[PDB]
Amino acid sequence: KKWFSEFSIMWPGQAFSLKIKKILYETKSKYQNVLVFESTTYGKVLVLDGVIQLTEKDEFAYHEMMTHVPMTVSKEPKNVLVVGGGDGGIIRELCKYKSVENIDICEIDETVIEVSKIYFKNISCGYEDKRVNVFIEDASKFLENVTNTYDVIIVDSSDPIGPAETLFNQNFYEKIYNALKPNGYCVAQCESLWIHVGTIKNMIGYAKKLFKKVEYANISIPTYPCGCIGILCCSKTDTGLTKPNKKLESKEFADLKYYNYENHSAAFKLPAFLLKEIEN
Amino acid sequence: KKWFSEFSIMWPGQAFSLKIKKILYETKSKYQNVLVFESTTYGKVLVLDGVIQLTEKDEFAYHEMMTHVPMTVSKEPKNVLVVGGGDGGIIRELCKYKSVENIDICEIDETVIEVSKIYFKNISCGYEDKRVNVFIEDASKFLENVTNTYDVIIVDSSDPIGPAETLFNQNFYEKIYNALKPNGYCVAQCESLWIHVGTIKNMIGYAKKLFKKVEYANISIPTYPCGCIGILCCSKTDTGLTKPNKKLESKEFADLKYYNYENHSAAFKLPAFLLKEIENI
Ligand SMILES: CSC[C@H]1O[C@@H](n2cnc3c(N)ncnc32)[C@H](O)[C@@H]1O
Ligand SMILES: CSC[C@H]1O[C@@H](n2cnc3c(N)ncnc32)[C@H](O)[C@@H]1O
């Protein structure tokens, strides 16, 4: 009985392994190597170019924090875009907001959507919502001509090596800024504070050229390297994304497993060493 | 270059590994297998029975949260007990409080204190402080017949597989409770909320039979399984441990790399699923 090991040039000197119960699917798509397996203790796992993208056991932490942070701050969002996120976990959490009109997703790799629909039904269930519109395209190309459209943009990308390489540069952030409404918000997956603080500082700096308020939050998730991942939070208004404007009290939100009102703000209380690195 | 991989029945089906620059020391003590190695990206690493105890790069997160949460709540803590903690990290943090009068440490395995002096001098530097008294004993035995003595008890244990087994039971918590002053506090290492909910529920339940207010806080640390570890927070007053009564702003605290006043309280804002489980204790 074998183990899967996640080793990368992006985090050298460390590795995380999961014991494999069985391999479910492996193929090479037009864009990336795609592996799906049942682990013995974290449920099903999705792997792209040898990097864990999700497990069934902990995916809610990431998907709920990335969605409910901006969606409890934006008032009356009508148009939201997911960049990347082919598994559909973000769309799942977005569907819970009954007054959103259009959920647009731009995913480069249609094989990730297919596989998610087949093997991760509890994640990909939102694709059935008739408000969902799917665009199969490089988001960097998709966003190049959009302006003044989205209330919230959620960048749920894979890591900078592979097709997401176009999503971690200044030009992309300008596109996000322009694609947003005047009071719109963006959140984006961003490097772990335990790995490359220099990358976080680079990303904050690209955002701060455009956005009035740029903040960083941490989410605990055991199957990403170092057991955590950042959220780069970008606001066009001065008030930012640290404090929710509403409580998720309706029935669609009863079963949340991570997010709540208090932990929203707590997510932005970062270790002292990081604060010092990003203050200056 | 070889890798070190951390396997345990306490975390089946997963493992974290670190690339080994060089092996520094390996010995079987009277109690456990002791390993020290230099990793390629985390510095030196202390391993006990095949489980990572600390690394140089991230040890401050655990030692600072474990220490400064109770020490900023207790108003005038003069006598403090560390259980376990042979490496010295909690003692280092405690020595920063000039107003502390006495620090007792009870550590079962003196080889771990010896190894820490040799290979972890930036962690073991407090053993030189003249306030520090060292007892080499199973803390379960040590605390029999200690009563109404400590303002703070900090239980920096290894995992419950091995000699720390005697620290993860109701009997231990009766001793802690008796050894603390009437407004004393205890904090105890209490495992990962991603995989140890069973243990976390058992421990909180033992503490709740004695203490009026029992809380749980989480610390981000990448070299413990799941990238986090919790603090079982035990108070004899109803106000508990979530709000500090002092700030760490003086020179002695200039070097803090994790803890601050907001982070203290934020540590206790737990994931929704964990809150639901703690409701079922
Ligand atoms: C699984 S969540 C991360 C996703 O980001 C998608 N992705 C990577 N690069 C891009 C890109 N340039 N545009 C849109 N989606 C992308 C990946 O194919 C993956 O499904
Ligand atoms: C390295 S910090 C953890 C410390 O807890 C110590 N320890 C484990 N069990 C006990 C015990 N029953 N009493 C005191 N210290 C202990 C271990 O030897 C280790 O040095």
Numbering used by the authors:
A (entry chain B): 41 to 320
B (entry chain C): 41 to 321
What's written in the study?
Spermidine synthase (SpdS; putrescine aminopropyltransferase) catalyzes the transfer of the aminopropyl moiety from decarboxylated S-adenosylmethionine to putrescine, leading to the formation of spermidine and 5′-methylthio­adenosine (MTA). In this work, X-ray crystallography was used to examine ligand complexes of SpdS from the malaria parasite Plasmodium falciparum (PfSpdS). A conserved flexible structural element called the gatekeeper loop covers the active site of the enzyme.
When putrescine was soaked into crystals of the complex of PfSpdS with dcAdoMet the crystals were not visibly altered and diffraction data were collected to 1.75 Å resolution. No changes were observed in residue conformations around MTA or spermidine compared with the structures containing either dcAdoMet or putrescine.
